[PDB]
Amino acid sequence: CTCVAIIMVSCVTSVWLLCRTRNLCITPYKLAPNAQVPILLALLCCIKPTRA
């Protein structure tokens, strides 16, 4: 019961910092939809594909 608490806390903390990294991927680029997008930051580091 102590071992499943470590595997639950560290799971929801690592994906919490990953969700912050996912969120900060976009707000440089959702603010200017006319700007072009590199192919490295589209699918490798972040999730958003090319749209519009």
Binding site: L24, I26, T27, P28, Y29, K30, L31, A32, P33, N34, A35, Q36
Partner: protein, 151 residues
């Protein structure tokens, strides 16, 4: 142009602007927009990059267009006057620099918005403005000079 202000108990303390595809609102003010179509939108908070949500449909969208690349240090228009500066913001005289002027857009000669002010009350003989802009390749950055109070 279209730039609706922000109300709080009658007095004017903030301004909200509409760009192509989105709406903006500064975080240094609290209040409700008097427009009913602009009040039911889920405005989500963000960092200093100032991400908001333009959930309004197309039929009133794109009152003005955001500025492209190739920014000179030439003439730029302003609600109280004019500014001629690209790296920093111009040393405008007094009068402008009061309270509640946050969110007023800075436009070019061709009616295209360049920067949105957020601070810089009074910095002596030369007054600077803390604005957001796109630095070199369209990435939206925030510029703040030294000692910039929230204005």
């Amino acid at each position: 142009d279209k730039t609706f202000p922000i109300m709080l108990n009658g007095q004017v303390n903030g301004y909200a602007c509409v760009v192509g595809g989105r709406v903006f609102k500064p975080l240094h003010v609290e209040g409700r927009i008097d427009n009913e179509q602009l009040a039911a939108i889920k405005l989500k908070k963000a960092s200093i990059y100032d991400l908001e949500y333009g959930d309004v449909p197309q039929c009133m969208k794109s009152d003005t267009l955001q500025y492209t690349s190739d920014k000179p240090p030439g003439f730029y228009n302003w609600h109280h006057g004019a500014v001629q500066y690209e790296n920093n913001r111009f040393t405008v005289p007094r009068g402008v620099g009061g309270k509640g002027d946050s969110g007023r857009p800075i436009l070019d000669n061709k009616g295209r918005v360049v920067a949105i002010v957020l601070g810089g009350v009074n910095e002596g003989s030369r007054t600077a403005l803390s604005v957001v802009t796109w630095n070199q390749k369209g990435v939206t950055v925030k510029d703040t000079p030294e000692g910039s109070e929230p204005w």
